[PDB]
Amino acid sequence: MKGDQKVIEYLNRGLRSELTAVSQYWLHYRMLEDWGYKDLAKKWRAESIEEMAHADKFVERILFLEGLPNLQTLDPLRIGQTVKEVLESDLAAEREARALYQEGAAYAASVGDFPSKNLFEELMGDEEHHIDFLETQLDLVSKLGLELYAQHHIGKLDD
Amino acid sequence: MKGDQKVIEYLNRGLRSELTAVSQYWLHYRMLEDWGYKDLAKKWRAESIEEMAHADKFVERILFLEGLPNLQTLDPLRIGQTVKEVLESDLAAEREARALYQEGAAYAASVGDFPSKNLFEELMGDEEHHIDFLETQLDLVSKLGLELYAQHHIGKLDD
Amino acid sequence: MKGDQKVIEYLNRGLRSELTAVSQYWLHYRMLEDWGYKDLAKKWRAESIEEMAHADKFVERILFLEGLPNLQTLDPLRIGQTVKEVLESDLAAEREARALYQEGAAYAASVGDFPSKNLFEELMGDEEHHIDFLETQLDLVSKLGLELYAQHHIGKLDD
Amino acid sequence: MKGDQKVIEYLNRGLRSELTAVSQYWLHYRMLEDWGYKDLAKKWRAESIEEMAHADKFVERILFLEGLPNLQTLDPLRIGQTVKEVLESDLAAEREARALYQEGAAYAASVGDFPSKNLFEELMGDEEHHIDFLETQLDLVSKLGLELYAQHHIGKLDD
Amino acid sequence: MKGDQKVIEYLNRGLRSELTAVSQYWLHYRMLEDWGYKDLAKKWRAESIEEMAHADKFVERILFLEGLPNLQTLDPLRIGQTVKEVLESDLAAEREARALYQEGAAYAASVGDFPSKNLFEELMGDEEHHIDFLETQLDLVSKLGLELYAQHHIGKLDD
Amino acid sequence: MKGDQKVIEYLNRGLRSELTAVSQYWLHYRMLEDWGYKDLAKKWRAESIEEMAHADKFVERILFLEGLPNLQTLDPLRIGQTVKEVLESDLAAEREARALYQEGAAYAASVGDFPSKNLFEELMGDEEHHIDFLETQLDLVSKLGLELYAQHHIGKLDD
Amino acid sequence: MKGDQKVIEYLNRGLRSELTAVSQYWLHYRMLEDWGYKDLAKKWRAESIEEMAHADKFVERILFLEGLPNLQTLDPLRIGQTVKEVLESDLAAEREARALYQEGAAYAASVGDFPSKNLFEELMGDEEHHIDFLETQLDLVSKLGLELYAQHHIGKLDD
Amino acid sequence: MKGDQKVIEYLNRGLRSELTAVSQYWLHYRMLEDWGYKDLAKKWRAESIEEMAHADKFVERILFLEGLPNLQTLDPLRIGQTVKEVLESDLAAEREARALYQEGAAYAASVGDFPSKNLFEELMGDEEHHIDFLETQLDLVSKLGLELYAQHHIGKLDD
Amino acid sequence: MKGDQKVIEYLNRGLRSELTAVSQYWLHYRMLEDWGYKDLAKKWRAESIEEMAHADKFVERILFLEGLPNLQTLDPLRIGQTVKEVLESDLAAEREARALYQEGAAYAASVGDFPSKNLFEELMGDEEHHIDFLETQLDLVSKLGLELYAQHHIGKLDD
Amino acid sequence: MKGDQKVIEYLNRGLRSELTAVSQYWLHYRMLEDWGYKDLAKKWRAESIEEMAHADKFVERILFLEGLPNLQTLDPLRIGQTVKEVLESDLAAEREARALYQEGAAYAASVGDFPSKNLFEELMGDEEHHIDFLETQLDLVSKLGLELYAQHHIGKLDD
Ligand code: HEM
Ligand code: HEM
Ligand code: HEM
Ligand code: HEM
Ligand code: HEM
Ligand code: HEM
Ligand code: HEM
Ligand SMILES: [Fe+3]
Ligand SMILES: [Fe+3]
Ligand SMILES: [Fe+3]
Ligand SMILES: [Fe+3]
Ligand SMILES: [Fe+3]
Ligand SMILES: [Fe+3]
Ligand SMILES: [Fe+3]
Ligand SMILES: [Fe+3]
Ligand SMILES: [Fe+3]
Ligand SMILES: [Fe+3]
Ligand SMILES: [Fe+3]
Ligand SMILES: [Fe+3]
Ligand SMILES: [Fe+3]
Ligand SMILES: [Fe+3]
Ligand SMILES: [Fe+3]
Ligand SMILES: [Fe+3]
Ligand SMILES: [Fe+3]
Ligand SMILES: [Fe+3]
Ligand SMILES: [Fe+3]
Ligand SMILES: [Fe+3]
Structure with missing residues (x-):
């Protein structure tokens, strides 16, 4: 069904944002595993897979609206060293990403594309849960120090 | 453990090749679904997820060898219209991808990094199974014509 | 609870649209069955039953808002012969129907009737999935021809 | 138990015929798989295994009659390209093969070797079922054309 | 995918070697059964069926490399009388067979056909397990004499 | 149904042969048990019971053909002492017995009594399996000596 | 089967290296248990038993190659006090151990003993997983300090 | 708890004895397997694992008594060739080993270290069961000859 | 049965020691629970119950030897405040307690009361396991500090 | 293994003592059953079977020490009439019996035969449990009179 070209541009911006998060989370998962924080590694792997589902929802919506999904490029990655x-x-x-989805939902609303608007708002709400998660971990690091925080999440040794 | 710099560069080239295949297969999966070839879409989703596991093997090995895995960029995508x-x-x-892994395995062997050599050889064997699959599909298309080939794989309608 | 009269008018327009789709899909189901395309018949029967649920949601909302649901008349049916x-x-x-729901959602939003707005937007999103379904079948018919498309969905012979 | 030398010669001719069919069917199975007709491939693999059982029955009978089973050589293979x-x-x-078994059964009957005769007649009846199978597939190819026949038996794509 | 002509010749030589072993082991199995060594017959039937799977691996790889598998002829059989x-x-x-696969693996490696190299190496390892088995049996025959060795393996009488 | 008198005479000769084998096998079973070869005893008991089934098939056929089955007398028994x-x-x-059944099958065939012919040929094939069994045991005794052969089949001691 | 003398010397050097690791890991396991780090003791017991299986693979291969496995001596143990x-x-x-297997695999390859080469490569890969594990633990000790690292792994108290 | 230094010396002598038996039994297990006596091989493997448990009990006791367990060296191995x-x-x-444990138990008793004494006496009793086992096998070899003894324990052939 | 009076005196000294440990462990269990170290509390409760079994074994032995078990008095308790x-x-x-049991075992041995001696030696061995347990916890407190040690064993919060 | 001759003499004295108890208990069991005290009969039967196990342990130990177990004679039986x-x-x-085992344990200890010593001490401890049992029954008879004691253990009447 022919979609609004600007909504399609926001969808592709969203797809880019999600691809970036998939890779950034996956790299951080494997970094956390290499450093030995296995319980933090398990959560990051799960967060990357949630973002993979987000990326998929954008590709499907872009195609339904007869756009061309662009998976060629990522936003710049931010790679920790601690x-x-x-x-x-x-x-x-x-x-x-939350700010992008907020913008995309408002735009889609303003042209009547309510199912696209709902997609952006559902994803906005998901990203606020990730922000809540990350803010909480930083708060722990602030109150306890990084060493006590990370030590708690080393996890169990493999068989 | 500090790895050979050139083996790490080959592993990063392999990572890029797998991340490209992941996105290329996933987009093709969703294009095939959008066109209504549900059985070919199932197969492409499965192939993409196989490539995801390959990408992850490269990230893991690069970190073990104290390299920096680079997930920032993909090789150029090839997007079909039929x-x-x-x-x-x-x-x-x-x-x-097969030629790259052949080269990487031969190089890893020449510096005695046999576990990196075995990763490239195992992946070279997997990519040959992919090549076999794809060549077989194109053969069916030559012998039967595209319409007969694609019609067989439309699949079942959703509940 | 006394509803907005214009929202109630949109709800009754929606109910009319759904009743029309229930009957049009059901007739097409039984036509597809009479022509022998049993797998297409099964899907049309399922689509008509989904529309029956849609019709029911409008009758319930109209009554809650102290309106009179009008099931007397249908929009004109479009009956295929192939x-x-x-x-x-x-x-x-x-x-x-999608355009109607888009209009009804915007209207309901503009008078603060958010649960009615949500009903129209949920149904709008459902109708886009039916449009996606139908567009895909027409795309198959375009690429393969009608005969190869319909032959695939003849289905199995009854016991 | 000392057997009739000419019956033993027919048994060894039969063994040769079966070894030839085992290999010819197995090669054709793997050809059909390489071309992508997986449902025809599954049937050819099953037919080759039935012939393996036939070959085994000849080796056992030859030994019981104190002959030397000869598995050194095959009749000439006929290899398709379509x-x-x-x-x-x-x-x-x-x-x-059917004509050979008919000859071997009559010969065995004429010297009173009834269990050898029964072996040849049981195998003759099995070979007529394979002939019936093959004739039927050629009849389909005649009535429908090769493309529609082979397309039906492409089968499902592997996980 | 077009393979190296010389690797394909090695794979066809391997195919011949396996088809020879299949027939040699199967005939030995049935000779051992005819002599009454039922436990040694069980083992030989099993070894033959292992070699069948090896033959099939070679047919599959030759076809993938767009070669013509040759099942027409065997190497000369060696048939024991005790x-x-x-x-x-x-x-x-x-x-x-072990020397042939050693050569084939070294040649495949020298042209970068690592998956064909790994097939020959895996088979070379399997043939070494066969050699180990057979050498062990001959050792028992040297230490105990053939009568004691073979008597242990007569096995159970059939219902 | 009135049968051919000569076929009935062959049936009664067969019955006599079977009664003789029932008793000869049963006596040998109990001799083998008395000498302590319990595994050979179990097989002889099983062989005698198979012959009892053979005897029964002759009595049933003779009666159906309105003959008088004669169970009065046995052929001379051969009783081992080792x-x-x-x-x-x-x-x-x-x-x-095999030679008798061969004669009876040919005779029955020559007068069109095909079900009697089939009975004799089925029994001929059964007797060749017993001959194969016995020849194999004698071959073992030849290659290993009687003491090593019989020692293997002493079996387990009763609770 | 007679093996290459130098490959057998490498396999005996590997055997010594594994027997050393078995005793070193087992003693460390029991020292960690004596100090009260029950989770680190579980892991070390498991690592020792992994090395036991490696030692056994070397004994088996040396005997197959008609060498004399030497279990008499170990390399010098390194016993920690913290x-x-x-x-x-x-x-x-x-x-x-990793360097020894790298050398052994390269030597075995150069004389065509590919199954011994594959044993050294498989073990070289396993030892790299051990190295990865140990490096990760030392990294945690650098980032968190030894007290925080070791406290996490005290484990549960025995019933 | 600080132990008696001489008891600790006996414990370490015991540990040495057990390490020697672990390796000597394990080597003999794999020798028996290479020669084809699989039932004797299974028992030797089990005896080596029992000795591994014995070795472990000495390491644990030495550490509890604040000694340093010495696993560096073995007593001289005795390697059969038949x-x-x-x-x-x-x-x-x-x-x-039995004589050592007898000495260690008496010594431990004379300094009041009753739990060490109990360890040596429990192990002494275990070693007498192994001696009883070995003496019995030698008695069989004396009464029956080595060939009849070893032939009984060849065991079954692997699948 | 009339026992040795001095052995009975040692048994009653032992009973006193056990009653003291029952109460001291139980009080410490409830102290650890009141301070919030629930995992240490669970272990102390278990240790007190083991000592209750020890006390019971002394009462039973004293009565069998026709002595009067004295449960009136405890040795002085040592009550922690950290x-x-x-x-x-x-x-x-x-x-x-270990020193007492060592003395009681030697005494009982010197008058031939071997079952009493065995009781004292079994209990001596049990007390060395408790000493090993306690020494290990003190070693942890030495290496990690009291705060990190106790924090690990706070345990879970009740439902 | 050659044992101490005097220990073997004590073992045979023990065997004699046990054989005597087996028969004395079994006779008393059947006497108690004949008099109608079935619950006492069940316990005596159980006590005789425990003594049978004791007798067996002596025969096994005597043989292991290369002595000749003497089961020819019993000590004098004491047969009740109430x-x-x-x-x-x-x-x-x-x-x-307890005094004998006490003597045999001390003797065995004095020549270092600790497993024989352990046998005598384990049996001494078992005999003290039987003495405890019997003394208790006599105490009941003293406090209650024989009639009230025996009446309690008449038991149930058989079906
Ligand atoms: C960084 C690149 C990526 C890596 C390393 C990666 C890794 C993986 C792995 C290892 C799994 C399987 C998880 C499991 O089975 O436990 C997976 C699942 C999945 N991935 Fe990816 N992935 C990547 C990119 C993608 C992209 C680009 C998409 C789609 C746009 C995608 C969509 C999925 C989906 C939808 C699943 C779950 C499939 C199912 O549950 O059926 N991933 N990913
Ligand atoms: C063309 C007129 C219609 C036809 C031919 C029709 C046919 C049917 C049939 C045969 C079923 C049962 C499906 C089954 O049990 O497999 C059904 C279910 C249903 N129909 Fe209708 N229907 C029609 C109109 C309506 C209307 C006007 C509504 C409500 C406004 C309605 C609401 C439902 C609902 C809600 C169910 C499912 C009931 C349940 O699952 O409990 N249908 N329809
Ligand atoms: C072209 C040469 C042959 C190939 C490629 C081949 C292949 C195989 C394969 C792969 C199987 C196992 C099928 C399964 O497990 O699904 C098999 C089974 C079997 N083959 Fe062969 N075979 C060959 C020649 C032989 C010969 C020469 C004989 C006997 C003369 C033989 C007798 C059997 C029998 C009897 C079985 C079934 C075994 C059982 O079910 O226990 N085959 N064959
Ligand atoms: C030597 C004279 C024979 C002896 C010692 C004998 C012994 C036996 C024994 C002990 C069984 C039962 C086997 C079992 O239950 O495990 C049996 C079964 C049988 N016998 Fe006989 N038999 C003799 C003659 C006969 C004759 C003359 C016939 C028929 C002509 C006969 C027909 C059968 C049949 C048909 C069975 C199996 C019955 C069933 O499975 O329902 N036997 N024989
Ligand atoms: C010759 C050197 C040794 C070899 C070849 C060896 C071999 C093995 C093998 C293959 C197993 C696992 C058995 C199974 O899972 O079936 C094993 C188990 C075991 N080994 Fe070793 N071992 C050796 C030395 C040691 C030493 C030095 C000790 C301790 C001092 C040890 C203690 C154990 C224990 C305690 C087990 C059983 C573990 C369990 O059941 O959880 N072994 N051994
Ligand atoms: C400090 C004085 C004691 C306290 C506070 C105490 C507490 C307890 C508690 C609460 C239980 C039950 C544990 C459960 O069911 O989880 C118990 C079990 C037991 N106690 Fe005591 N106890 C004390 C003294 C004794 C004494 C003096 C003896 C014997 C001399 C004794 C022998 C037992 C035995 C044998 C059991 C287990 C009973 C069974 O498992 O059947 N305790 N104790
Ligand atoms: C008075 C002479 C004896 C009599 C009347 C006797 C009676 C029995 C009875 C009736 C049983 C079987 C109990 C049951 O199945 O409920 C039995 C078991 C047993 N007896 Fe005897 N026995 C006697 C002497 C012996 C001797 C001299 C020994 C060994 C030296 C012996 C060793 C055994 C053993 C070891 C069992 C148990 C066997 C098992 O559980 O597998 N008995 N006794
Ligand atoms: Fe997201
Ligand atoms: Fe997110
Ligand atoms: Fe890949
Ligand atoms: Fe691929
Ligand atoms: Fe609808
Ligand atoms: Fe709809
Ligand atoms: Fe056939
Ligand atoms: Fe056929
Ligand atoms: Fe092979
Ligand atoms: Fe082989
Ligand atoms: Fe018969
Ligand atoms: Fe017969
Ligand atoms: Fe290792
Ligand atoms: Fe390791
Ligand atoms: Fe030991
Ligand atoms: Fe031992
Ligand atoms: Fe205690
Ligand atoms: Fe204690
Ligand atoms: Fe006793
Ligand atoms: Fe007793």
């Missing part, structure tokens, strides 16, 4: 910098990198990206 | 061009696009990409 | 004309008739009706 | 030529190659071989 | 000569016949054949 | 002589006695009887 | 020195002791030993 | 020499080698070692 | 002092109090008591 | 005399007869025998 557990605190991993948290802060992901938080900064999630804040930019 | 079922036949989807088949041809994926086959071109798999042929380049 | 599988292609069945697809095209249902697509044209679904396009008119 | 699905039609695969069907025709196997049919021609099955016609020669 | 349990000891059966052991010695099979061991001679396995030693020639 | 395990080797038991094997040789049963082999000599089985050779005479 | 959790950190246990980690460092095991990592030094694993780095020497 | 089944009889394997039995005799293990018997000679078990006789020396 | 987790470290709880560990040290229980260790000091366990050291005195 | 329930009180049955109790007193068994008590007197158990007192003599």
